[PDB]
Amino acid sequence: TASIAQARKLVEQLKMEANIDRIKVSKAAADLMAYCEAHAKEDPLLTPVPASENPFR
Amino acid sequence: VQLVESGGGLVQPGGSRKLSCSASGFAFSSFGMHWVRQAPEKGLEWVAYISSGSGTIYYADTVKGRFTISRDDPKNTLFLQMTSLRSEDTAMYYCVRSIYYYGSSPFDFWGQGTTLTVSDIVMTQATSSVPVTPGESVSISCRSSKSLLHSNGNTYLYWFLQRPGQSPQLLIYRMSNLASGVPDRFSGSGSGTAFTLTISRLEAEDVGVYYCMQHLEYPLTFGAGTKLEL
Amino acid sequence: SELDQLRQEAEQLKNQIRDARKACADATLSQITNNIDPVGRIQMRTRRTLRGHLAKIYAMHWGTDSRLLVSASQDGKLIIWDSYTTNKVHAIPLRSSWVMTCAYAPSGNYVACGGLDNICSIYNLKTREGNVRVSRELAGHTGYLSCCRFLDDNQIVTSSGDTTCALWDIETGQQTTTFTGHTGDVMSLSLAPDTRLFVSGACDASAKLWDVREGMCRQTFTGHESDINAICFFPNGNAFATGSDDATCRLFDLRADQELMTYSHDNIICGITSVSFSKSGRLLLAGYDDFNCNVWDALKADRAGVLAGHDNRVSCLGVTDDGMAVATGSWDSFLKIWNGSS
Amino acid sequence: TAVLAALMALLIVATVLGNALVMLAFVADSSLRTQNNFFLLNLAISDFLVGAFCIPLYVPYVLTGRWTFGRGLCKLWLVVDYLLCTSSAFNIVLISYDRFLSVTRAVSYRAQQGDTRRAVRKMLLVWVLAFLLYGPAILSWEYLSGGSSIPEGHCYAEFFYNWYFLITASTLEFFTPFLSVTFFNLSIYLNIQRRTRLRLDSFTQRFRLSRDRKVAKSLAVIVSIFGLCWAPYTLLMIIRAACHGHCVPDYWYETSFWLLWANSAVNPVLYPLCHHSFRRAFTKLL
Amino acid sequence: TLSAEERAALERSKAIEKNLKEDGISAAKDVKLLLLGADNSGKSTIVKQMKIITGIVETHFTFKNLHFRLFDVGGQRSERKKWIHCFEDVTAIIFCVDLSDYNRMHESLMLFDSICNNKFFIDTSIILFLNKKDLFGEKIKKSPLTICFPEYTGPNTYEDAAAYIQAQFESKNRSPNKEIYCHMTCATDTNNAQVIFDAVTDIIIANNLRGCGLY
Ligand SMILES: CC(C)CCC[C@@H](C)[C@H]1CC[C@H]2[C@@H]3CC=C4C[C@@H](O)CC[C@]4(C)[C@H]3CC[C@]12C
Ligand SMILES: CC(C)CCC[C@@H](C)[C@H]1CC[C@H]2[C@@H]3CC=C4C[C@@H](O)CC[C@]4(C)[C@H]3CC[C@]12C
Ligand SMILES: CC(C)CCC[C@@H](C)[C@H]1CC[C@H]2[C@@H]3CC=C4C[C@@H](O)CC[C@]4(C)[C@H]3CC[C@]12C
Ligand SMILES: CC(C)CCC[C@@H](C)[C@H]1CC[C@H]2[C@@H]3CC=C4C[C@@H](O)CC[C@]4(C)[C@H]3CC[C@]12C
Ligand SMILES: CC(C)CCC[C@@H](C)[C@H]1CC[C@H]2[C@@H]3CC=C4C[C@@H](O)CC[C@]4(C)[C@H]3CC[C@]12C
Ligand SMILES: c1cc(Cc2c[nH]cn2)ccn1
């Protein structure tokens, strides 16, 4: 009775995942794009800092 | 962690004496060791330094050539061989451990000291004594002839507290950091050559003499010391 | 009878979720980010080379001060480096040399590691004795330890090859919560910035989102074709990226509950070992079996640059908290620090 | 005339950069720190200075026919030239002795492999013994035998026409090293053949037998090239000393003279290039 | 280095670097062996004098001035190809096969093929062990070898039956550069340490010859 016990748990888990609220992909894509734009200047790898401000000269 | 000194006592002028510092409860071979002396009714004076691994040895000018500092790592014993002892050498000699890596706290533990009786950046603490009352905020000032701020961003200024009858204890290391086991009421502030130790909500235990030491370069020099009295 | 009926209901639920995800898939991230300008060519130089490991480096982790880092090698040595000076701050001899993961506590007082010995060992870096000592050995996993991350000085999350993740109370040495549901070996985990959620990637080619406090799986992310080896949260916590053996990296969204973008190239046919984001999240850096680290444009899925400075697998990488530099560890026993110049 | 100048320049070019890559690869790679890797560096160091200091300085001696650099500088060149070639011969014995230990004392060789303290100590002994063979002899021959028989404008060893010293010096410089290299490379072949014989006593067995033959050809070339470059000059010096140059053609001496320096250009091809660890380092740099 | 504390910090780092080299030199003097085989193939007691030093079980012993470290990975029930690359720098692989178990005989053949042709063990030699050869000879009388190998058509004698099984495993090796050291051992056999030492010595010489540039 191992398979039948596992089947009940797997079905019950899928119910929880199917009841979540999902936003549109366009809404989710915009938020990721917005965060990158807002923090672009404080990203040293994206925009390398002048050598005076680089600890790894 | 324990540091017990022995070998001190009354000696004749021009004689020789061997001071020992036995270490227990910590990795002795990992710590550099200093000898610091304090003349009776005087401030602290650094004597010698031996690094971990015995590779680097420093002496104060007043003792260089007469004193020899050595360590025995397997026995966890620190030695100070003294020769041609003068009346200027009459002091209490303290054994001080100090480990050096990024973010370490040198001079964190001091020994009880041994008494010997014989028959350069200038650190200034102009205020010898300060009358204080419990629960009131107190500020102590220290000055240096040279800027203690290094190009790496560290300001190598240390604060010590020597309560009456007790060995010195580290309060502030590198001018702002609070030593382990020290209440948060102590705060170190400074810039360039002028430094301030602020003690908010002073208590009975804080009564004592406060010394500022520079570790920017050798020889390490101490201030005169500021005494707090009720 | 009952078993057959139940497994049919699972298929209906899977179709319900797939239809639900397709309903909210109105647009594509590629379409959204078409207008924005590319990041250009990302050129990074090796500022530092950390030498001293005498075997394959398997893991590295930056400290929160963006200066100290811990690396693990199978020479049985945990080393803590001062990256500014290349000074070695500590060298921790490991009881078991088969280490696969290492973690630096955000407080800086502890480091953790563990591998094929099925143990997560906690090391105290700030002791009155002046040496690093083992403070805790977390036993309870029945498979190898693949990843570990501190939440604080008292809590750590570990993923294992026994298909489970665990949340541990370090002071008591017991796992308070066990996260079950993966059908394969869990190879990696990433903590959300608020440390309320964490994602894990397993060898069942799926990524599961777990609630730390509640202790259950909130969402499951599929789309990879082979074992997931690496996983990393987006800096705002609303997305994560994975790396698998199918030579692809995928960006999954938590709120949209689906994949948003795939980062693969036709020349790339090797597995991915490590993934990380830049501070703004615009760059996705991935380590590969072909000895290289490819810098991707996270929004546009363009290969921005290549870090080619290792003669063996890039086994691990990490970006500092301030975003100043990226470290790469490799099977050639070297660590390298990279950043660009104006 | 100009052709001879180009050939000498080519030998200078090949010897300098050829032995420089071995030194460049040794510095570039930090994993090349086994005692064998140090010994190959020492051979490269000895041969590098031959093509950079000795051969370039000797070019005027051939084109002009007279030594115009002075009596004092000639003694320096004689000592350096005899030191480097003697050290090059002693390095080859050191490399062959190293390979002899790896096959025979395999357990102990691997235990002591990577011990840089022994490698540096054995490297120093090569240079110390190399100097003691010709250093004191060249410097103190004029000051102990009376005058100098070397005509003004000529630069060669004081014992150039001596018969008793040349045969004795060459015995400890080439005759003993050549028999040692022959003995060492022969014992490697016998051990490999014997070990494979017990192994057999398929596709795998064919490959192992083919590998042993490839080593045998590699071992034979090493002994042959070292013998081919050094034997003519070493024999000519002893023969020419007996007849004082009457029985030896003048142009024959120079031809055998350049064979020893030609050995400094083939050594990088033999030991480092055929070495597996150094071959990867060459590809890594280029 | 300029600061007084930085100079002592640099000295501490140099002292650490020196100890790392000393540990690595002592570590390189050990012969690391990966122990593989079936679930019950005699790998637990392959050497009598060895002593143990869910996880990886490491066993070490010293034989004729050579230190052997044997790692048993049978306790790892997880996916092997996720952690088998941790042993890419192993000196040799010891594979144990039980000749008295026909049911697991075909299990060993497919297990041998994957390890022999693994991408991380191309140049790694294998010391194949065929244990319980005395029980195989006793059991070959009533039970013919054709039960486990239907394609076997040779004589039913013990000498040929054991040789056929050995040839089956060596047929899995598709790389001419790999050398397999097969040995027929009993339960009461007490020279397995010598067999490993003889095989490892041959492997070391091949490694040394590569190290000295002859290969
Ligand atoms: C790299 C290769 C080409 C080097 C070749 C070296 C040999 C073949 C060349 C270089 C130097 C040349 C010698 C230079 C000087 C002399 C002395 C002269 O009175 C006879 C010719 C003779 C003896 C030349 C013979 C050929 C020679 C020995
Ligand atoms: C005319 C002479 C004096 C010029 C100098 C030649 C000698 C002294 C120079 C030239 C090449 C140099 C070597 C170049 C590379 C290395 C590898 C390094 O890990 C140790 C130092 C070492 C071994 C150097 C030692 C000194 C060296 C051999
Ligand atoms: C072991 C090896 C490296 C030692 C080498 C020592 C060499 C470099 C030293 C020791 C003796 C020195 C020689 C002593 C005497 C003379 C005679 C003088 O008119 C020219 C310089 C000259 C020729 C010196 C050249 C350099 C010299 C040969
Ligand atoms: C013209 C004459 C003087 C040249 C003499 C060459 C001698 C002095 C030079 C050239 C090669 C040098 C060696 C090259 C490599 C090493 C290994 C290093 O770890 C220690 C120093 C050591 C051992 C050097 C010692 C000095 C050395 C032997
Ligand atoms: C007076 C001297 C120069 C004449 C002797 C020349 C020959 C016989 C000497 C010079 C260099 C010497 C070698 C130098 C170094 C070693 C390494 C040592 O571990 C074994 C002996 C060995 C291999 C020596 C063997 C003998 C040797 C080859
Ligand atoms: C013999 C001869 C020399 C001098 C020489 C001959 N050829 C080139 N250089 C040096 C050492 N041993």
Residue E109, domain CATH: 3.40.50.300
Q: DSSP code of C105? A: -
Q: Are C28 and A25 in contact (CB under 8 A)?
A: yes
* Distance between first and last Cα of chain A: 65
SS3 category, C135: strand
The single residue listed with the structure tokens 């996260």 is C179
Residues near D51 by Cβ (< 8 Å), separated by ≥ 6?
A: D11, D12, D13, D14, D15, D16, D19, D261, D264, D265
Per-residue HEC secondary structure of chain B comes to CEEEEECCCEECCCCCEEEEEEEECCCHHHCEEEEEEECCCCCEEEEEEECCCCCCEEECCCCCCCEEEEEECCCCEEEEEECCCCHHHCEEEEEEEECCCCCCCCCCEECCCEEEEECCCCEECCCCEEECCCCCCEEEEEEECCCCECCCCCECEEEEEECCCCCCEEEEECCCEECCCCCCCEEEEEECCEEEEEECCCCCCCCCEEEEEECCCCCCCECCCEEEEC
Out of D107, D219, D276, whose CB is closest to E65?
D107
Chain C: residue whose CA lies nearest to E87: C98
What number of other Cβ atoms are within 10 A of residue E64's Cβ? 10
User: For residue B122, is it left (φ>0), alpha (ψ between -120 and 50) or beta?
Assistant: beta
Out of C52, C56, C143, whose CB is closest to E77?
C143
Experimental resolution (Å): 2.8
Report the alpha-carbon distance of residue E123 to residue E119 in Å, rounded: 10
Report the alpha-carbon distance of residue E60 to residue C74 in Å, rounded: 18
SS3 category, C162: coil
Report the alpha-carbon distance of residue B134 to residue B206 in Å, rounded: 9
Q: Are D208 and D196 in contact (CB under 8 A)?
A: yes
The DSSP secondary structure of C28-96, one letter per residue, reads -HHHHTSSSPP------EEEEEE----S-EEEEEE-TTSSEEEEEETTTEEEEEETTTTEEEEEEE-SS
- For position C56, which CATH number holds? 2.130.10.10
The Cβ-side half-sphere exposure at E51, using a 13 Å CA radius, reads 3
Instruction: Take residue B108 and report the two structure tokens written for it.
Output: 């964190």
* Distance between first and last Cα of chain D: 36
CA angle D10-D15-D17, nearest 5°?
Answer: 95
Report the alpha-carbon distance of residue E87 to residue E69 in Å, rounded: 12
SS3 category, D27: helix
Residue E136: in which H helix or E strand, if any?
helix E133-139
For residue C79, which amino acid is it? Answer: I
What number of other Cβ atoms are within 10 A of residue B190's Cβ? 21
Residues near E195 by Cβ (< 8 Å), separated by ≥ 6?
A: E127, E181, E183, E185
Determine how β-strand B114-118 pairs with β-strand B91-98.
antiparallel
Q: Where are the alpha helices (H) located in chain D, listed in sequence order?
A: 2-28, 35-49, 55-63, 71-104, 106-112, 116-145, 164-170, 176-200, 203-243, 250-274, 276-285
Chain B: residue whose CA lies nearest to C65: B103
Contact between chains at E5 and B218 (C-beta distance less than 8 A): no
What number of other Cβ atoms are within 10 A of residue C43's Cβ? 15
SS3 category, C336: strand
Report the alpha-carbon distance of residue C129 to residue B26 in Å, rounded: 4
* Residues 23 through 62 of chain E touching chain C, CB cutoff 8 Å: 23-24, 27, 54-56
Residue A50: in which H helix or E strand, if any?
none
Residue C10 included in any domain = no
Determine how β-strand E30-37 pairs with β-strand E67-72.
parallel
Q: Is E131 assigned to a binding site?
A: yes
Cα separations in angstroms, C31 against A25, C35, C250, C252: 11, 8, 16, 16
For residue B155, give the nearest of B122, B127, B128, B194 by alpha carbon: B194
D53 touches ligand 2 (CB under 6 Å): yes
Q: Are C250 and C241 in contact (CB under 8 A)?
A: yes
User: Residues B129-167, buried b or exposed e (16+ Cβ, 10 A)?
Assistant: eeebeeeeebebbbbbeeebbbeeebbbbbbbbbeeeeb
What is the least distance, in Å, from the CA of A39 to any CA of chain C?
5
Residue D171: in which H helix or E strand, if any?
none
Residue A27: in which H helix or E strand, if any?
helix A25-38
* Helices then strands, each counted (H, E), chain A: 2, 0
Ligand 5 center–CA D87 separation, angstroms: 10
For residue D131, which amino acid is it? Answer: F
D175 touches ligand 5 (CB under 6 Å): no
- Long-range contact list for D158-165, CB < 8 A, 24+ apart? D160/D237, D160/D241, D161/D240, D161/D241, D161/D244, D161/D245, D162/D241, D163/D238, D163/D241, D163/D242, D165/D137
Report the alpha-carbon distance of residue C241 to residue C204 in Å, rounded: 16
Residues near B178 by Cβ (< 8 Å), separated by ≥ 6?
A: B171, B172, B184, B186, B187, B188
For residue E79, give the nearest of A3, C204, C72 by alpha carbon: C204
Greatest Cα pair distance, chain B, in angstroms, is 50
Q: Are D40 and D275 in contact (CB under 8 A)?
A: yes
For residue C196, which amino acid is it? Answer: R
Q: Are B199 and B131 in contact (CB under 8 A)?
A: no
Chain D: residue whose CA lies nearest to E208: D102
The Cβ-side half-sphere exposure at E184, using a 13 Å CA radius, reads 17
Determine how β-strand B114-118 pairs with β-strand B10-11.
parallel
Q: Are B159 and B138 in contact (CB under 8 A)?
A: no
Those chains having 3 or more beta-carbon pairs within 8 angstroms of chain C are A, B, E
Instruction: Take residue E119 and report the two structure tokens written for it.
Output: 């991408």
Residues C222/C225/C229/C234 CA torsion (nearest 10 deg): -40
D139 touches ligand 3 (CB under 6 Å): yes
Sign of torsion over alpha carbons C155, C158, C162, C164:
positive
Q: DSSP code of A42? A: T
E3 at C interface, C-beta within 8 A: no
Contact between chains at D103 and E215 (C-beta distance less than 8 A): no
Q: Are B45 and B59 in contact (CB under 8 A)?
A: no
Please, what is the angle between helix D35-49 and helix D71-104, to 10°? 160
SS3 category, C243: strand
- Long-range contact list for C104-108, CB < 8 A, 24+ apart? C104/C61, C104/C62, C104/C63, C104/C64, C104/C68, C104/C69, C104/C70, C104/C150, C105/C150, C105/C152, C105/C153, C106/C64, C106/C150, C106/C152, C107/C64, C107/C152, C107/C153, C108/B103, C108/C63, C108/C64, C108/C65, C108/C68
- Long-range contact list for C172-181, CB < 8 A, 24+ apart? C173/C136, C173/C137, C173/C138, C173/C139, C174/C140, C175/C138, C175/C140, C177/C212, C177/C215, C178/C215, C179/C208, C179/C210, C179/C215, C179/C217, C181/A13, C181/C208, C181/C217, C181/C220
The Cβ-side half-sphere exposure at C138, using a 13 Å CA radius, reads 33
The DSSP secondary structure of D58-124, one letter per residue, reads HHHHHHTSS--S-HHHHHHHHHHHHHHHHHHHHHHHHHHHHHHHHHHSHHHHHHHTT-HHHHHHHHH
Pocket around ligand 6: residues whose beta carbon is below 6 Å from it? D 81-82, 85-86, 173, 233, 257, 260-261
Instruction: Take residue E161 and report the two structure tokens written for it.
Output: 């039956």
Report the alpha-carbon distance of residue C32 to residue C47 in Å, rounded: 36
Q: Are C52 and C79 in contact (CB under 8 A)?
A: yes
* Distance between first and last Cα of chain E: 46
Those chains having 3 or more beta-carbon pairs within 8 angstroms of chain A are C
C278 at A interface, C-beta within 8 A: yes
* Residues 212 through 271 of chain D touching chain E, CB cutoff 8 Å: 215, 218-219, 271
Nearest residue (by CA) to ligand 2, atom 15, is: D23
Contact between chains at B27 and C82 (C-beta distance less than 8 A): no
Residues near D143 by Cβ (< 8 Å), separated by ≥ 6?
A: none
Report the alpha-carbon distance of residue C295 to residue C43 in Å, rounded: 10
Residues of E in contact with B32 (CB under 8 A): 8
Report the alpha-carbon distance of residue E194 to residue E185 in Å, rounded: 12
Spell out the domain ranges in chain D: 2-285
Instruction: Take residue E117 and report the two structure tokens written for it.
Output: 């042709």
The single residue listed with the structure tokens 């070297």 is C334
Touch between chain A and chain E: 3 or more Cβ pairs under 8 Å: no
Compute CA E161 distance to the chain's CA centroid, rounded to the nearest angstrom: 24
Look up the domain containing E56 and give its range: 4-212
Residues of B in contact with C87 (CB under 8 A): 101-102
For residue C166, which amino acid is it? Answer: A
B73 CB-contact burial (10 Å; exposed 0-12 / middle 13-18 / buried 19+): middle
**Is-cis flag, bond preceding E176, omega within 30?**
no
Out of E9, E19, E54, whose CB is closest to C87?
E9
Out of C16, C220, C279, whose CB is closest to A43?
C279
Out of E3, E7, E12, whose CB is closest to B154?
E3
Architecture of domain D2-285: Up-down Bundle (1.20)
Contact between chains at D107 and E207 (C-beta distance less than 8 A): no
Substitution site in D79, D120, D121, D134 for ligand 4 pocket (most atoms within 8 Å of beta carbon) = D120
Those chains having 3 or more beta-carbon pairs within 8 angstroms of chain D are E
What is the least distance, in Å, from the CA of E204 to any CA of chain D?
7
Residues near E35 by Cβ (< 8 Å), separated by ≥ 6?
A: E43, E46, E59, E70, E71, E72, E73, E94, E96
Cα separations in angstroms, E54 against C116, C162, C188, E98: 9, 11, 20, 23
Cα separations in angstroms, C218 against A16, A29, C149, C204, E85: 7, 21, 20, 17, 33
* Helices then strands, each counted (H, E), chain C: 2, 28
Q: Are A45 and C278 in contact (CB under 8 A)?
A: yes
Backbone φ and ψ of E18, nearest 5°: -65, -40
Task: Give the number of whichever ligand sits closest to the CA of residue D26.
Answer: 2
Instruction: Take residue E122 and report the two structure tokens written for it.
Output: 């191309």
C218 at A interface, C-beta within 8 A: yes
SS3 category, D244: coil
The DSSP secondary structure of E158-208, one letter per residue, reads HHHHHHHHHHHHHTT---TT--B--EE--SS---HHHHHHHHHHHHHHHHH
D125 touches ligand 5 (CB under 6 Å): yes
For residue B81, which amino acid is it? Answer: Q
Residues of E in contact with C146 (CB under 8 A): 82
The DSSP secondary structure of E16-84, one letter per residue, reads HHHHHHHHHHHHTTEEEEEEEE-TTSSGGGS-SS-EE---PEEEEEE-SS-EEEEEE-TT--S-GGGTG
Q: Is E134 assigned to a binding site?
A: yes
Ligand 6 atom with least separation from CA of D54:
9
The single residue listed with the structure tokens 């050498």 is B89
Residues near C324 by Cβ (< 8 Å), separated by ≥ 6?
A: A44, A45, A49, A54, A55, A56, C66, C339
Ligand 1 center–CA D84 separation, angstroms: 20
Report the alpha-carbon distance of residue E131 to residue E94 in Å, rounded: 12
Instruction: Take residue B62 and report the two structure tokens written for it.
Output: 């007043």
Named by the residue before each, gaps in chain C exceeding 2.5 A from C to N are: none
E86 at C interface, C-beta within 8 A: yes
Q: Does domain A4-56 have CATH number 3.40.30.10?
A: no
What number of other Cβ atoms are within 10 A of residue D206's Cβ? 10
Residues of E in contact with B218 (CB under 8 A): 4
Sign of torsion over alpha carbons E187, E189, E190, E193:
negative
User: Residues D154-188, buried b or exposed e (16+ Cβ, 10 A)?
Assistant: ebebbbbbbbeebeebbeebbeebbeebbebbeeb
Q: Are D181 and D189 in contact (CB under 8 A)?
A: no
* Distance between first and last Cα of chain B: 32
Q: Are C26 and A22 in contact (CB under 8 A)?
A: no
Report the alpha-carbon distance of residue E48 to residue E194 in Å, rounded: 12
Nearest residue (by CA) to ligand 5, atom 24, is: D94
The single residue listed with the structure tokens 């705002």 is C236
Q: Are C284 and C248 in contact (CB under 8 A)?
A: no
Report the alpha-carbon distance of residue D44 to residue C87 in Å, rounded: 34
Instruction: Take residue C69 and report the two structure tokens written for it.
Output: 């880092």
D279 CB-contact burial (10 Å; exposed 0-12 / middle 13-18 / buried 19+): middle
Those chains having 3 or more beta-carbon pairs within 8 angstroms of chain E are B, C, D
Q: Are B29 and B73 in contact (CB under 8 A)?
A: yes
Q: Are C188 and C230 in contact (CB under 8 A)?
A: yes
Greatest Cα pair distance, chain E, in angstroms, is 84
D27 touches ligand 2 (CB under 6 Å): yes
Task: Give the number of whichever ligand sits closest to the CA of residue D139.
Answer: 3
Out of C75, C93, C161, whose CB is closest to E78?
C161
For residue E145, which amino acid is it? Answer: L
Ligand 2 atom with least separation from CA of D80:
1
For residue E196, give the nearest of E25, E49, E86 by alpha carbon: E49
The DSSP secondary structure of C224-241, one letter per residue, reads -SS-EEEEEE-TTSSEEE
Task: Give the number of whichever ligand sits closest to the CA of residue D141.
Answer: 3
For residue D2, which amino acid is it? Answer: A
Q: Are B49 and B123 in contact (CB under 8 A)?
A: no
Report the alpha-carbon distance of residue B121 to residue B156 in Å, rounded: 12
Domain B2-118 has what CATH class? mainly beta
For residue C271, give the nearest of C201, C176, C333 by alpha carbon: C201
Task: Give the number of whichever ligand sits closest to the CA of residue D25.
Answer: 2
Q: CATH for B123-223, among 3.40.190.10, 2.60.40.10, 3.10.180.10, 2.40.30.10? A: 2.60.40.10
